[PDB]
Amino acid sequence: MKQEELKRLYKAQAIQRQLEEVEERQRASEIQGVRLEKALDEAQLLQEWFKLVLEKNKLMRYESELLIMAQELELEDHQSRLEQKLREKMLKEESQKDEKDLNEEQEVFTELMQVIEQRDKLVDSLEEQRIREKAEDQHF
Amino acid sequence: KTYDYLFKLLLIGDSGVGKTCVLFRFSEDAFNSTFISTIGIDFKIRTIELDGKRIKLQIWDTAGQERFRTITTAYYRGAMGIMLVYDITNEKSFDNIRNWIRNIEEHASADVEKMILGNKCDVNDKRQVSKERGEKLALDYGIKFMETSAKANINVENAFFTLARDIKAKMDKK
Ligand SMILES: Nc1nc2c(ncn2[C@@H]2O[C@H](COP(=O)(O)OP(=O)(O)NP(=O)(O)O)[C@@H](O)[C@H]2O)c(=O)[nH]1
Ligand SMILES: [Mg+2]
């Protein structure tokens, strides 16, 4: 049994549920895309196709976002494992630590810090998405 | 998505003063008496909406112990807010706030916002630092101060809200 990693797994599943909804409507939107492409009152339907382009856009923003949220939770899990492993290694005294023990202890500390690093890289790239959305949606 | 902008914050202070439990109650509405010292550094997210604005809080939690002080220094620079946490039940923690501020000057870029909290005020019984001492010290530096308790959810909100705004005001005003 587990304890409030629970939250991580329920949330991961919900993220893939809504991911699933999203590429569902990506498929639908794409097919209406080529139907109306086949078409070309025509002014009204051009308005509608405009709506659909807006829709593809919104769906991509949400999709790339969900993909990030997913890898966020995967990293959080990996971090949890790595961390508790380093601590179990740290309970033994330094006097009892040989080269194998010391070095692999070492190795998991650095892997841990690197995982934290990538978490932050996702925060930052998530931000570049926020700012680009502001920038080109500025015309809208 | 939801956030207009995100601010990087930093929690520093002697080990055991409760930085991690403070961040834990802010982000999770919860507390755990169990003492598990931060290894290296961590960070957690909470998005807030003040001034009709949603801001993503990326809150870095430093390890108090000198072992990692080295590593923790690395993350002072990007910080856009910093909270110096001392323990009311320990005065030596209170006196090291000077050491932490020196660390801030050596590594954080001078523009940083700053705030001080005396935590574990949930029980006065073993208080060794009077609240008046803390405030006059903060005023000496000019930065805002507050006592808090992660056990009792006192001012954790309050604190994070105000430092978050002061960085807002400072940066949008610029
Ligand atoms: N009564 C009370 N105890 C608290 C409060 N905040 C933390 N504690 C307790 O004090 C200890 C400090 O916890 P912790 O948050 O790990 O402190 P820390 O400053 O993060 N330690 P470190 O810097 O080594 O990681 C824990 O045993 C915790 O349960 C508080 O507001 N009130
Ligand atoms: Mg801690």
Author numbering:
A (entry chain B): 533 to 572, 582 to 681
B (entry chain A): 3 to 176
Show the paper's wording.
Rab proteins, the biggest subfamily within the superfamily of small GTPases, are major regulators of vesicular trafficking in eukaryotic cells. One such family of effector proteins that was reported to link Rab proteins and the cytoskeleton is the Mical (molecules interacting with CasL) family. In this publication, we present a thorough biochemical and structural analysis of a Rab effector domain termed bivalent Mical/EHBP Rab binding (bMERB) domain. The results show that the domains probably constitute a Rab8-effector family involved in endosomal trafficking, and the Rab-binding specificity can be well explained from the 3-dimensional structures of complexes determined in this work.
Well diffracting crystals were found using the RBD of Mical-cL (residues 534–683) in complex with different Rab proteins (Rab1, Rab8 and Rab10). In all structures (Rab1:Mical-cL, Rab8:Mical-cL and Rab10:Mical-cL) we found one Rab protein bound to one molecule of Mical-cL, in agreement with the previous observations that all Rab proteins tested bind only one site in Mical-cL. Most interactions were visible between the Rab proteins and α-helix 3 of Mical-cL with some additional contributing residues from α-helix 2, forming extensive contacts involving residues within switch I and II of the Rab proteins. Whereas we observed KD values of 2.2–5.2 µM for Rab1 binding to the bMERB domains of Mical proteins and no detectable binding of Rab1 to the bMERB domains of EHBPs, we detected strong binding and ca. 100 nanomolar affinities for Rab8 and the different bMERB domains. Besides the specificity of bMERB domains towards the Rab8 family, another interesting observation was made in the ITC experiments comparing the stoichiometry of binding of Rab8 and the different RBDs: Whereas Rab8 bound in a 1:1 stoichiometry to Mical-cL and EHBP1, a 2:1 stoichiometry binding was observed for Mical-1, Mical-3 and EHBP1L1. In contrast to the main interacting helix α3, which adopts a similar position in all three structures, we observed slightly different orientations of the α-helices 1 and 2, adopting a position slightly further away from Rab1 compared to Rab8 and Rab10. Interestingly, whereas Rab1 contains a glutamate near the N-terminus (Glu4), all Rab8 family members contain one or (in the case of Rab10) two lysine residues in this region that point towards a negatively charged patch in Mical-cL. The sequence of the N-terminal residues of each Rab protein is shown below the corresponding structure: Whereas Rab1 contains a negatively charged glutamate at position 4, Rab8 and Rab10 contain one or two lysine residues at position 3 or at position 3 and 4, respectively. (c) Consistently, ITC measurements show that the affinity of binding increases approximately five-fold after mutating the N-terminal residues (Rab1:Mical-cL: KD = 5.2 µM; Rab1R8N:Mical-cL: KD = 1.1 µM; Rab8:Mical-cL: KD = 0.23 µM).
